[PDB]
Amino acid sequence: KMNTKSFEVLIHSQYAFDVCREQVYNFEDCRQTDTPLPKDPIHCKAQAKEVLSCYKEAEKMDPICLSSFNDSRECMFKSDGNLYNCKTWINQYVTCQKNPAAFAEFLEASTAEQLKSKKFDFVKNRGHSDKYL
Amino acid sequence: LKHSATVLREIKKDTIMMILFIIGGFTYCYHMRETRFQLDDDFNEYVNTNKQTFRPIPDHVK
Amino acid sequence: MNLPWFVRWGTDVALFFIPAYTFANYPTTFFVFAAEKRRQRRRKDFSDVKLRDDAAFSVDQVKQLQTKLHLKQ
Amino acid sequence: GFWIAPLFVNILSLPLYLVMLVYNIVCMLLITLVIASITLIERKVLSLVQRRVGPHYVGYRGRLQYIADALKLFIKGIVVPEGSNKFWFVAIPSAAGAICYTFWINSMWGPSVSIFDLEYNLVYATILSILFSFCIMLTGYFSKSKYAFMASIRCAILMLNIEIFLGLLVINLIFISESFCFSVFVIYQEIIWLIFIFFGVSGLIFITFLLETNRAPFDLAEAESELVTGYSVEYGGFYFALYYLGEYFHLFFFSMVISIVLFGGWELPNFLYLFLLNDFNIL
Amino acid sequence: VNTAYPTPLKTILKTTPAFVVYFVFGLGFSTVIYDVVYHPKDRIERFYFRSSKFERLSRKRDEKLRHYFKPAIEWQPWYNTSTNNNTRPLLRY
Amino acid sequence: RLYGRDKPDELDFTDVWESSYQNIICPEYFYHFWFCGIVYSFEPEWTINYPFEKGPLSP
Amino acid sequence: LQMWGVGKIIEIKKFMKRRDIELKGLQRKAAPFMQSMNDVRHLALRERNDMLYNELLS
Amino acid sequence: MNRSIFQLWKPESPRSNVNSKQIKTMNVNFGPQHPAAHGVLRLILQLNGEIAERFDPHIGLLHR
Amino acid sequence: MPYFVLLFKILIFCVVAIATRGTLPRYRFDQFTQLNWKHFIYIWLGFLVFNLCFVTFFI
Amino acid sequence: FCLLFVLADAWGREKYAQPYKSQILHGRQPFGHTFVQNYRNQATDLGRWNHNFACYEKQPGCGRDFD
Amino acid sequence: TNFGSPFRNTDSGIVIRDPENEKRLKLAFQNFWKSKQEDKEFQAQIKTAVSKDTVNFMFYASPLFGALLGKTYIDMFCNPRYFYFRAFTLSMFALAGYCVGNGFRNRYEHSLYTRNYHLFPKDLQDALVNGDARYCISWWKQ
Amino acid sequence: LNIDGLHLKYNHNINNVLYYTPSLVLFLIFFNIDYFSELELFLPLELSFIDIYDDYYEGFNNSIMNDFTPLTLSYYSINSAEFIIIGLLLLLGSVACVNLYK
Amino acid sequence: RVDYIVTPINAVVSWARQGSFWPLTFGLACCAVEMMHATVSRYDFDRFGVIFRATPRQADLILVAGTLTNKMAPGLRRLYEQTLDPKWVLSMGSCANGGGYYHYSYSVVRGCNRIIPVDIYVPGCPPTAEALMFGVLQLQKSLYRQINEGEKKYNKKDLTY
Amino acid sequence: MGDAVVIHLIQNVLIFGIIFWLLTWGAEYFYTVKQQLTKKQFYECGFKSISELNIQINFNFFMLAVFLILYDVEFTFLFPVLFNFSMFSTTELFLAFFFIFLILVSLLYDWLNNVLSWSAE
Numbered sequence A: 001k002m003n004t005k006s007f008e009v010l011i012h013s014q015y016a017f018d019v020c021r022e023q024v025y026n027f028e029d030c031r032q033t034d035t036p037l038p039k040d041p042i043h044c045k046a047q048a049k050e051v052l053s054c055y056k057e058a059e060k061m062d063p064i065c066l067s068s069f070n071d072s073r074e075c076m077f078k079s080d081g082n083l084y085n086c087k088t089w090i091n092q093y094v095t096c097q098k099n100p101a102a103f104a105e106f107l108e109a110s111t112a113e114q115l116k117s118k119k120f121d122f123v124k125n126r127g128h129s130d131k132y133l
Numbered sequence B: 001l002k003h004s005a006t007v008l009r010e011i012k013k014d015t016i017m018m019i020l021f022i023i024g025g026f027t028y029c030y031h032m033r034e035t036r037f038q039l040d041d042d043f044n045e046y047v048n049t050n051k052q053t054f055r056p057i058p059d060h061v062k
Numbered sequence C: 001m002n003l004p005w006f007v008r009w010g011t012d013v014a015l016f017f018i019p020a021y022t023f024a025n026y027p028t029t030f031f032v033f034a035a036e037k038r039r040q041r042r043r044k045d046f047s048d049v050k051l052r053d054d055a056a057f058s059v060d061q062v063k064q065l066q067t068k069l070h071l072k073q
Numbered sequence D: 001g002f003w004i005a006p007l008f009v010n011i012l013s014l015p016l017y018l019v020m021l022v023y024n025i026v027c028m029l030l031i032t033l034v035i036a037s038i039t040l041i042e043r044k045v046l047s048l049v050q051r052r053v054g055p056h057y058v059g060y061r062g063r064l065q066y067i068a069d070a071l072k073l074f075i076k077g078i079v080v081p082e083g084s085n086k087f088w089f090v091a092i093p094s095a096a097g098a099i100c101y102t103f104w105i106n107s108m109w110g111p112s113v114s115i116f117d118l119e120y121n122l123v124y125a126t127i128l129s130i131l132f133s134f135c136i137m138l139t140g141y142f143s144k145s146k147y148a149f150m151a152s153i154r155c156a157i158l159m160l161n162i163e164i165f166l167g168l169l170v171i172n173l174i175f176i177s178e179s180f181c182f183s184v185f186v187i188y189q190e191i192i193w194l195i196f197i198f199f200g201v202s203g204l205i206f207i208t209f210l211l212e213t214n215r216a217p218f219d220l221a222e223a224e225s226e227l228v229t230g231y232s233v234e235y236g237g238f239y240f241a242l243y244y245l246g247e248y249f250h251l252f253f254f255s256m257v258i259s260i261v262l263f264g265g266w267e268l269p270n271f272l273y274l275f276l277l278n279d280f281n282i283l
Numbered sequence E: 001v002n003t004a005y006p007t008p009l010k011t012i013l014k015t016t017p018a019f020v021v022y023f024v025f026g027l028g029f030s031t032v033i034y035d036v037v038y039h040p041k042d043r044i045e046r047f048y049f050r051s052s053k054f055e056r057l058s059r060k061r062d063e064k065l066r067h068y069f070k071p072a073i074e075w076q077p078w079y080n081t082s083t084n085n086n087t088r089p090l091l092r093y
Numbered sequence F: 001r002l003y004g005r006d007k008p009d010e011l012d013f014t015d016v017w018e019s020s021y022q023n024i025i026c027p028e029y030f031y032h033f034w035f036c037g038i039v040y041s042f043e044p045e046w047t048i049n050y051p052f053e054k055g056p057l058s059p
Numbered sequence G: 001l002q003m004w005g006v007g008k009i010i011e012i013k014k015f016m017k018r019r020d021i022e023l024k025g026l027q028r029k030a031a032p033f034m035q036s037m038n039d040v041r042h043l044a045l046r047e048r049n050d051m052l053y054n055e056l057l058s
Numbered sequence H: 001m002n003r004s005i006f007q008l009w010k011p012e013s014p015r016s017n018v019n020s021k022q023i024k025t026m027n028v029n030f031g032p033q034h035p036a037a038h039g040v041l042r043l044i045l046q047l048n049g050e051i052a053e054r055f056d057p058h059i060g061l062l063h064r
Numbered sequence I: 001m002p003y004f005v006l007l008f009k010i011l012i013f014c015v016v017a018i019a020t021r022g023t024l025p026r027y028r029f030d031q032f033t034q035l036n037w038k039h040f041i042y043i044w045l046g047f048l049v050f051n052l053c054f055v056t057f058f059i
Numbered sequence J: 001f002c003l004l005f006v007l008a009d010a011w012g013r014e015k016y017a018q019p020y021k022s023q024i025l026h027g028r029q030p031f032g033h034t035f036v037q038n039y040r041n042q043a044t045d046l047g048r049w050n051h052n053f054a055c056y057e058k059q060p061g062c063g064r065d066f067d
Numbered sequence K: 001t002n003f004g005s006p007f008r009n010t011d012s013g014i015v016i017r018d019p020e021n022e023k024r025l026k027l028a029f030q031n032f033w034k035s036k037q038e039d040k041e042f043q044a045q046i047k048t049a050v051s052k053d054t055v056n057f058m059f060y061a062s063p064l065f066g067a068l069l070g071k072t073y074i075d076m077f078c079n080p081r082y083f084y085f086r087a088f089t090l091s092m093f094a095l096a097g098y099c100v101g102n103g104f105r106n107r108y109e110h111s112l113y114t115r116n117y118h119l120f121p122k123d124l125q126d127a128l129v130n131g132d133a134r135y136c137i138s139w140w141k142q
Numbered sequence L: 001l002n003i004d005g006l007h008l009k010y011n012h013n014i015n016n017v018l019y020y021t022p023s024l025v026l027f028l029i030f031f032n033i034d035y036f037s038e039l040e041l042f043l044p045l046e047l048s049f050i051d052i053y054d055d056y057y058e059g060f061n062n063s064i065m066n067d068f069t070p071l072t073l074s075y076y077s078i079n080s081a082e083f084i085i086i087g088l089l090l091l092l093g094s095v096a097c098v099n100l101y102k
Numbered sequence M: 001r002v003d004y005i006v007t008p009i010n011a012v013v014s015w016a017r018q019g020s021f022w023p024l025t026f027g028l029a030c031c032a033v034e035m036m037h038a039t040v041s042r043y044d045f046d047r048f049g050v051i052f053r054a055t056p057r058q059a060d061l062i063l064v065a066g067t068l069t070n071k072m073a074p075g076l077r078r079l080y081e082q083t084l085d086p087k088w089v090l091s092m093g094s095c096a097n098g099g100g101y102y103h104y105s106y107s108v109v110r111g112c113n114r115i116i117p118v119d120i121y122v123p124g125c126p127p128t129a130e131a132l133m134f135g136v137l138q139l140q141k142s143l144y145r146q147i148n149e150g151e152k153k154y155n156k157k158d159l160t161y
Numbered sequence N: 001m002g003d004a005v006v007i008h009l010i011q012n013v014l015i016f017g018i019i020f021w022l023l024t025w026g027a028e029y030f031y032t033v034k035q036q037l038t039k040k041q042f043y044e045c046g047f048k049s050i051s052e053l054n055i056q057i058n059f060n061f062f063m064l065a066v067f068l069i070l071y072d073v074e075f076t077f078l079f080p081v082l083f084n085f086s087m088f089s090t091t092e093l094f095l096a097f098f099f100i101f102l103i104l105v106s107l108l109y110d111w112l113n114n115v116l117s118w119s120a121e
Ligand SMILES: CCCCCCCCCCCCCCCCCC(=O)OC[C@H](COP(=O)([O-])OCC(O)COP(=O)([O-])OC[C@@H](COC(=O)CCCCCCCCCCCCCCCCC)OC(=O)CCCCCCCCCCCCCCCCC)OC(=O)CCCCCCCCCCCCCCCCC
Pocket: C012, C013, C015, C016, C018, C019, C020, C022, C023, D048, D061, D063, E012, E013, E014, E015, E016, E017, E018, E019, E020, E021, E023, E024, E027, F037, F038, F041, I011, I012, I015
């Protein structure tokens, strides 16, 4: 439907959740049910199509965001889909997407260590009390 | 196994110190649990900082 | 001319530890460069991604900014 | 090419199976070398305890003693007793060797560094241990030596005890980890090794380790004084080499299991600086 | 000035070469396992069961789409092999 | 108890503590392990290299 | 030691749960779009099956 | 602790199956080539459950 | 990598096992079975109950 | 003795706030448990079920959304 | 540290050591506190689990209490003839007391930067949650 | 018991031809409880589509991490009565075993 | 020719079987104590890679250490025959060699070589621990050389035929 | 639990054992086995074994196996509650303690009756 892979879809959604909020609310209200069992998608097809169109609109990014998007993709590749471990890079991507004009100064105020290749190896660097959930 | 006065005194002091040590350990565990409660409260405040919106269930659910 | 016994023992310990430590830290021996190249290839490009029309900075401007800042080294 | 390509769809995959076989062979050979080195270490450590040089002339300063003994065990000839069952006498050691060389699959060397993505590592270990005990009992039975049969009965008793002992240990351990996978233990053991919780039952943990390793005071099956040799009193050459290799494989891998589940696995002993450490870093 | 080793350390050092050989073999075995499991995935992928439900769904969505959804939606009556050597159901019954 | 199979008229909690120490925390695997494995290994080996050295003899 | 170690393990578990709250929040943010894509694909397959069934049974 | 005399001893009654050896006892040749035996002891041992019952020592293997 | 420290610990435990084999005597099967089923099973179960109680207290 | 101690402590934990009361006396179970346990339970009478958040209306902080 | 920062998984994936960034972030928050020091209304709404006076007293008293306990322990059970083990155990007790006190102080800091999260501006909140100080350029003089 | 492995000299052919072969034939002829279950390959796999469906809302609301959830919900929540009955049964069985030994 | 491969493999086999030379745990008389003395630390046997095995099936050397009596000769023959090949026999002590102090006895066999083929003899009564060590090392050297003692003749191309 | 990789690894382990089989066969070239009367007979410490294949043992500790059969299942019943003890409630806690108490009482009864030790027959 998107021709986009799962982790990239998650990264894009972390920002798109704030631009198509009304469509997301409409979809959620349509799918609401009195039991945990899911509702038939045939009823929510229209809201789903609206949400997907807005997501197509939102997926576009400025070129200045490309480095942040790539590092977030690398993080989400090395970690098997753990959003929490890579939220910092996803947060940087969201910040660049929102008001990309200020991201120029954001990058300008960068330290030597930050201006370096970002390689992720979670086996070597597990972290602190990582539950993987 | 008759015991001398010195050995009996040492045994008695060992028992008393063991009792005090156990009581202190239980008290510290109680304090540690209270500390965990405080940390949970702090983190709940932090998380709820921005998650303040509650959406009512639609009327069609019933 | 003589050296302390602990100095000699430390020399032996280093002889054992430095190679073992390096080998453990680099299990993919001599293919680390290939791994770097594969990571570079995985990294996406402007053409691969789709960009907004009202971009604050053009692709050329972004490239010039990255070159000036030395973003990747 | 269009009409010829279909003929090779299944022919171009055999090299992949060959590569898989080669990698498995390499892993098995490497673990065999590790176990041989473990045997040499055992001889040298016992030599230190007994104040003797130990292997020193098979290879310069005894560097190839394990290689020499393995080659000699290969060289030694074998004969099956006439009264014994020819088929089973050879079938049992073959199954034992297969099981022992399958042991290494249930091993982890990192957060997810395992040959296979197994979750029920403890279940696998229990099943493999039960199979090896089966092989030992069958060895003792089919070698009609009375000493071997008594060794098999002793092995049965040891297995009976191990069931409850290891089951209770695993029950206590899973209560924290909540999983059978070895990885889940290390994440909890990062701050403090899990042995601190069990410090009171440290003696029982030592007993469990020795009992599962079949080391003293639990070397009843292979007791060389009470029984001639044990379950292998009528086996020589590589048939007995297989049993020895299996015993050392079990020792090595259960040592790994204990280290992972109770001593932090691949986490350094950070508890030695617990007082000086800080639990958070906020800028 | 006989700067010889202490007696206890000299006695202990006898068994050290065995330790060194054991470390060599153990590092070889561990590195072989690491490389064998690392090459196919280009990484040390976390175990599937060591992940949340949502993470599992996100990880396996692409595989499901590539293996089942596309053949299902491009299915034709004459695509199936007459020998009944078709792909097995995702949830085998 | 030292003189025969009989037992004292009045047992004390010292016996309880000793039995608890011996059973709950098995001291063998630590006491003896240390005392022998770790300590006795610090003594020089008693071996005589026969090919290049000979044992003491007398005329 | 047993009591203190159990307390420490519970502390670790509760810290993990604290972080799981944020992970769940991120997953919630990402949920609607993947759900929409999955629903659209599911409905496309259902439409194909409905067309086939109607043609075969009519 | 309760009594265990009946579980600890089994007498033999005349012409009684229950009070008799209902098992084929293990007649082992403990030694001479046995690590525990000093080397010249041929002890015929009657084991029943790995518990010695009957001893028949032969000690002439070192008569000189 | 983690397997470096893991191999170190495995070597330590192997040396411990070897030293224990060189030091300690050997048990009887009946003696160990009686000890286990009379003392150690109860010890394990009591330890499990204590852990359950402590976890309930802390949670 | 440990059981008595923990039970006494649990009954004394009523002083703390609701989320920190003893789980022995207060239930905290997954959504699958709670829904089936309190579906038509007039004793608890939690109310309607929030499908996309998996909780009842009357449970504290059932629907917690961003912004 | 045992747990690292509560906002993010510290040293997860790539390990980052940026003392310059840490100093800039600390300076930014110091400037924020100094700027809002005079605001009585702002100071009124600051909340913490444990009072600053209480945590300071605990920090400066726990090591002393530990040292006193160690002194009592060595007097009761240790032979005065020797001194190495007595010094070691006394230092261990003092370090245990210091551990308790330092934990009190660190938990106070955690509470200070968590309970008062809503009082910070958006840029400072982002800078605190993430490891980068680039979100708060204005605060550290750039 | 039966260490040597020697067993009774039994000929199964007599009963096989007298009672068991015909009775089995009749039972197989007249026995089928499977009502309408369909084999795999009965229809093309491409017609089945439900297995691809994923519920992401339920996924992120789900916190379970082990496959013992149904077992605990059964033994300790729903079928706890049978759980206690099994415990009492095992206790009484141990008593019966001891008495049989005596 | 096979010799190209056989000869180096012969050397490897001889080296391996020399390095791992496990005798049988079998002692009959005072000579047993001397064997134990060689096994223990002062003259460590393990240095030369000899470790004793209880079962004959796992033994390479038969240490006939002690007097052999008529009441035991069938047992010695059975043990020798049951020991897995290849194997060697070492007589230790005067009693094992030729009857020793009891050569004029009515119960003692005048030599274990009458019942068994003896590969090597170690004189002594008792042989010293170093004497037993010397005998074992000489037996090991002879064993290593036994594989190729220059039996086959070299042709014009220096290849054995 | 694994996948078909486990079966393929079993096959690979058998292929690996074929290597040791080849080595053992090749070793045959460096020794000759003579035919002797007692070379292929049961070993009984240097004398002929009187009995073979009638080697019945006495199973006088069968109560331990009998009780193991029950206690294995009793312990197995505890796994789900231990795994999901974070979900424990009043009922689950009561049931777990009830079950553990039943196990303890059964063990105590066994000890009282003295069936955990070797008997005359
Ligand atoms: C085409 C490619 C070309 C590439 C370039 C060219 C090739 C480069 C290759 C470089 C590496 C080759 C190997 C070098 C070996 C050097 C040995 C040496 O120094 O000679 C002295 C040494 C003297 O030993 P010895 O005569 O037996 O000892 C006499 C007495 O025992 C008295 O003992 P002592 O007083 O002498 O003390 C002994 C010990 C004392 O030292 C110590 O104590 C420290 C070590 C022990 C630590 C123990 C930790 C556990 C503690 C447990 C508890 C406490 C202990 C006590 C416990 C009991 C207490 C009661 O000191 C040592 O022997 C240290 C030597 C360390 C050598 C190992 C180095 C590598 C190890 C890691 C693997 C490397 C993989 C490749 C990496 C490549 C990239 C870099 O020579 C030896 O005999 C070697 C002994 C060690 C075994 C080495 C086995 C090597 C096998 C071949 C490996 C091939 C694969 C790897 C290379 C692949 C190509 C890159």
